[PDB]
Every structure is written in structure tokens, then in C-alpha cells.
Design a protein around this ligand. Sequence first.
Ligand SMILES: Nc1nc2c(ncn2[C@@H]2O[C@H](COP(=O)(O)OP(=O)(O)O)[C@@H](O)[C@H]2O)c(=O)[nH]1
Ligand SMILES: [Mg+2]
Length: 165
Amino acid sequence: SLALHKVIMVGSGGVGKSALTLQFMYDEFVEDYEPTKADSYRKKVVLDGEEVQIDILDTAGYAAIRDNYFRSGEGFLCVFSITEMESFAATADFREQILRVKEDENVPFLLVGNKSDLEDKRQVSVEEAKNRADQWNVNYVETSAKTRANVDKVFFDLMREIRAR
Ligand SMILES: Nc1nc2c(ncn2[C@@H]2O[C@H](COP(=O)(O)OP(=O)(O)O)[C@@H](O)[C@H]2O)c(=O)[nH]1
Ligand SMILES: [Mg+2]
């Protein structure tokens, strides 16, 4: 059995949780994935010379069920869309939930600003997202599930944080 890294995708609706997951898993940009469907994925990848298994829980939004899922997670990709300010505002809600369940302010966590390809319709500045990440002591990365920009990066960077726990 190889090392297993459990990642959880969180964020408000339509930010790109599923598209990022499927782009990472199948190298395809899926634009119509059922908004209400939560699923898990698993695949073997090579992380810095070592073959490891990554498990990704793509959440879709009772309390006991959601808490158990967060407890099982080892790292979190907190996603928002750079084109929707409200989704950025919502990241504070997920941060609070994760800290409540994990009871660890150093839990592997990346703030992910998705849909970077839509610069034209950006509502969240790089400055404000970076500032929030700094205040939370986490790293910020902008991705595009459409062009694949930084998609592998966020998953691999998070795995390195899980490995370093
Ligand atoms: N242009 C663009 N559209 C994206 C991107 N990521 C997701 N989308 C679109 O946004 C919609 C919602 O994405 P989805 O991954 O299903 O959101 P979820 O609710 O967070 O799972 C879909 O129509 C996607 O094709 C991205 O990086 N760029
Ligand atoms: Mg989804």
C-alpha cells in the first residue's frame, strides 16, 4: 500500500470544484457536471519521485455527515471564482468550518482562485486574495479548469503540505 493523501474540495456553488477535480483526474474540461452531485475520486500519481495515491472528495454543499467528511480529509482546496465576489466572501465560512472540525490552524489548506482565464470579468483582485491568504497563513494560487493553468500545481502543492504535516 502506497501513501494515501485525502483531499477535500470546498467552496460555494459554481466556483469550479468539479471542473478542477475532473481536469486533474481525466485531463478534460467538463462544463455540465451535475451541480448537486458530490463524489470521490482516486488515482495514483508520482509526487517528487514517489508513487502515491490521491483521493479527492468533490463536495456539492445532516451536520454529522459533512463533519465526518471534513474529519476524514487531510488537506483542503478552498475554491472561489475570481469572477464572483460572493464566492470569495464565502471562503471565510468554509475556513471556519474546517478549523472547527480539524481544530488545527495549520491544516493543509490552499486558497484557490479559479476561472483565471476570465480575467475580463474578474471581481476579486489578486491583492485582496493574497492578503486574505497571508492573514490565514496559507498560500494562494489562481487556476483555470478550462485551460488547465495551475491545476496540477494546486493538487501537488497540497499533497506536499499533507506530507509535511
Ligand atoms: N471559463 C471557465 N469556466 C469554468 C472554470 N471552472 C469551472 N467553470 C464553469 O463553471 C461552471 C461550474 O463549474 P463546476 O466545476 O461545475 O462548479 P462547482 O459547483 O464548484 O462544482 C461550469 O459551467 C464550468 O464549465 C474555469 O476555470 N474557467
Ligand atoms: Mg460540483
